[PDB]
C-alpha cells in the first residue's frame, strides 16, 4: 500500500511520527510521549492515511529507529531492524 510518511517531528524535524505520541528518527531514537512527539498528535486530523518507515516489523508496524520497532502505539526492541 502506497502511503505517505506521517508528519515529521522531534529535534529539527529529523523524525517521523509513527503514531499519536511516538516520534522516532533513524538517527534519533524514539520519543514516546515526550515533548519531541508533540507534532504527532496533529497527524490525527489529517484525513489522509500515512505510514512511516519501510522495513515492516513485528506487532504490526515497522522499523522506526536503529533496532527499534514501533507501530502506532508501541515501540519494542527488535534487532531485525
Amino acid at each position: 500500500l502506497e502511503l505517505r510518511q506521517c508528519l515529521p517531528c522531534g529535534p529539527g524535524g529529523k523524525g517521523r511520527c509513527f503514531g499519536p505520541s511516538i516520534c522516532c528518527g533513524d538517527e534519533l531514537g524514539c520519543f514516546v510521549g515526550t515533548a519531541e512527539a508533540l507534532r504527532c498528535q496533529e497527524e490525527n486530523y489529517l484525513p489522509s492515511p500515512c505510514q512511516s518507515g519501510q522495513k515492516p516489523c513485528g506487532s504490526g508496524g515497522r522499523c522506526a529507529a536503529a533496532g527499534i520497532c514501533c507501530n502506532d502505539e508501541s515501540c519494542v526492541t527488535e534487532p531485525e531492524c
Binding site: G19, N44, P47, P49, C50, Q51, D72
Partner: peptide, 9 residues
Amino acid sequence: CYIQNCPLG
C-alpha cells in the same frame, strides 16, 4: 491519520 486508525478504513 495513522493508516491503522483512519476513519472509514
